UniProtKB/Swiss-Prot annotation, chains A, B:
Activity control note: Inhibited by pyridone-containing alpha-ketoamides compounds 13a and 13b. In turn, alpha-ketoamide 13b (tert-butyl (1-((S)-1-(((S)-4-(benzylamino)-3,4-dioxo-1-((S)-2-oxopyrrolidin-3-yl)butan-2-yl)amino)-3-cyclopropyl-1-oxopropan-2-yl)-2-oxo-1,2-dihydropyridin-3-yl)carbamate) inhibits SARS-CoV-2 replication in human lung cells. Inhibited ex vivo by michael acceptor inhibitor N3. Inhibited ex vivo by compound 11a and 11b.
Location of cross-link Glycyl lysine isopeptide (Lys-Gly) (interchain with G-Cter in ubiquitin): 5, 90
Location(s), subcellular: Host cytoplasm; Host Golgi apparatus; Host nucleus
Result for mutant: residue 49 to A: Does not affect ability to cleave and inactivate human TRMT1
Active-site feature positions: 41, 145
Coverage span on the entire protein: 3264 to 3567 of 7096
Known role: Cleaves the C-terminus of replicase polyprotein at 11 sites. Recognizes substrates containing the core sequence [ILMVF]-Q-|-[SGACN]. Cleaves and inactivates human TRMT1, preventing tRNA guanine(26)-dimethylation of tRNAs. May cleave human NLRP1 in lung epithelial cells, thereby activating the NLRP1 inflammasome pathway. May cleave human GSDMD, triggering alternative GSDME-mediated epithelial cell death upon activation of the NLRP1 inflammasome, which may enhance the release interleukins 1B, 6, 16 and 18. Also able to bind an ADP-ribose-1''-phosphate (ADRP).
Cytoplasmic side, ranges: 1-304
Outcome of swapping residue 90 to R: In strain: Beta/B.1.351
Origin species: Severe acute respiratory syndrome coronavirus 2
Protein name listed in UniProt: 3C-like proteinase nsp5
Outcome when changing residue 132 to H: In strain: Omicron/BA.1, Omicron/BA.2, Omicron/BA.2.12.1, Omicron/BA.2.75, Omicron/BA.4, Omicron/BA.5, Omicron/BQ.1.1, Omicron/XBB.1.5, Omicron/EG.5.1
Domain (Peptidase C30) ranges: 1-304
Reactions the enzyme catalyzes: TSAVLQ-|-SGFRK-NH2 and SGVTFQ-|-GKFKK the two peptides corresponding to the two self-cleavage sites of the SARS 3C-like proteinase are the two most reactive peptide substrates. The enzyme exhibits a strong preference for substrates containing Gln at P1 position and Leu at P2 position
Amino acid sequence: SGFRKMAFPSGKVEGCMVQVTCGTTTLNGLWLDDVVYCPRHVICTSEDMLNPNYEDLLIRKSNHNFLVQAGNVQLRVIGHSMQNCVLKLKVDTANPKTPKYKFVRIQPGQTFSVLACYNGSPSGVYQCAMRPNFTIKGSFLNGSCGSVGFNIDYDCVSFCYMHHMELPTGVHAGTDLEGNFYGPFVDRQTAQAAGTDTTITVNVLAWLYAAVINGDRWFLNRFTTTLNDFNLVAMKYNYEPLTQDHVDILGPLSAQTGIAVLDMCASLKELLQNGMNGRTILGSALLEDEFTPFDVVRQCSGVT
Amino acid sequence: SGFRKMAFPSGKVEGCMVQVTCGTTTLNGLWLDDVVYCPRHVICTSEDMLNPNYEDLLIRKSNHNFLVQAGNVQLRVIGHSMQNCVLKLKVDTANPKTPKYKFVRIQPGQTFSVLACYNGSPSGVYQCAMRPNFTIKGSFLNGSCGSVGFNIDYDCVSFCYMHHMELPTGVHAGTDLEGNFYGPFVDRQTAQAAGTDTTITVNVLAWLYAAVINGDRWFLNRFTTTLNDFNLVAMKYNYEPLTQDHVDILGPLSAQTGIAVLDMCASLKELLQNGMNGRTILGSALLEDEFTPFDVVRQCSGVT
Ligand SMILES: Fc1cccc(CNCc2ccco2)c1
Ligand SMILES: Fc1cccc(CNCc2ccco2)c1
């Protein structure tokens, strides 16, 4: 029993983190096989960042201009290319600690773990979701860029995120490991405003299931609803619409608890209309939306 | 910017986790040098657990009765002793992945990271505090016993906790790595009730500082107070008393933000008397007490 905001163990990712320096700019890189992946803005002076032309800035750079340090030992860069907003530095040594891995582009509402690093050294690990506006609410200081988001399936690290930007509102933007930004963001120090940070409805529902499973039941009501009825209320409350895809995914939690998905939807609806009345669920005073259905099953069944 | 509930990277601890089996009972052990530490109740049948005599149960056990598996390779047990509520199994191989480490007995309100494991395999990592009633609010299923709590200072893992018990109320009890329980708990399946789960006042104050630092300022008021005045209100609200020791420790956050500790105390006092009025601080609807002053400095300054 107990339910916790739980990150994947970070060991497999700690073994991939390096320091990348280009001139006076230092940030984190990900060393997988003989490639080091890092934010392309490593090549910019914070002056460059105001309106950088990366292709033109890159012309000025050679393999030897990129310093890669893994522990306190330098790696030899024998090639570099830009892919979208990341640099791929070919090093002469394949990473001894390279885990099995994939690069995956996740969907808004998907959760992942961040290993926050500075100078290629890990400082901490936390659990995140991709917000529906394709931002994340991270904890990231200067030097944290190139810190990565991941999921683990048994022994295979799926890398989904690389940290690039803090927006003026202090939320975070970054790329998949092919250098494609989540959302409409660009690696430039310019006014960029996020869209509406809606609640991930399917995740709240999963966490309501986690709560029932763990004995927090006070909020279970005598009502059910429909997807259409619920989705009218959702809209009003800046909740994401719920689809039959979300209902399908909640099936196993529905089955384990014997609470039909639409009944839990009606429980949620009343929580939205009534608020918590100073009560808590799993020691939270608001509805938590940073557990997926898969997260709740995993934690509640004890997957390793 | 951003503030996150952040665990230490778990890599150094992942490399210490083994499976310990004694008869039909399997749980996690910690392999440091040539010793495997695990809960002594590894020797019990859930029948034994109702009123176990560990010394008498141990007489029946030899070195060879303890099966230790690290990855999928067996370690040879060449000795065993009981120290308080842990078994120390001497193995013939020192752990290649042994980090620099210490065993430390932490104080209530101290935070640490848990690497939740099953069959000596890590499933997740989360950040905890030792509650003032010497329980923790973990996430722990059957097979999680021997999972450990730790802090890291640069390259040195301080092990402070080993998981033993879930109380009937679903909160968790365990030992330091010398097998001494936190609080008045015993490794026995018997009615054991926790005392009052008070709020860690100094930690709430630290997190109020973290909030000011990150731009959440709405709650800052026009009042100050005294330790005595504040401690009257604290008492009423099941907050731990604040000492000059807590004030000393908050000094650096006070200095960085220019908010005197007693002014922040008066801010807290009003939050207690008024509640949040449906507002949030660092995206929380209640006051967070699972960041220490040292946690807030570390995260806000970016230590690795
Ligand atoms: F040069 C290499 C290139 C790719 C893989 C490897 C071996 N990686 C083993 C491993 C997994 C986790 C920690 O170490 C070495
Ligand atoms: F047999 C041994 C006994 C004690 C220590 C060691 C070496 N430990 C090195 C290390 C640190 C982190 C990962 O590996 C080996």
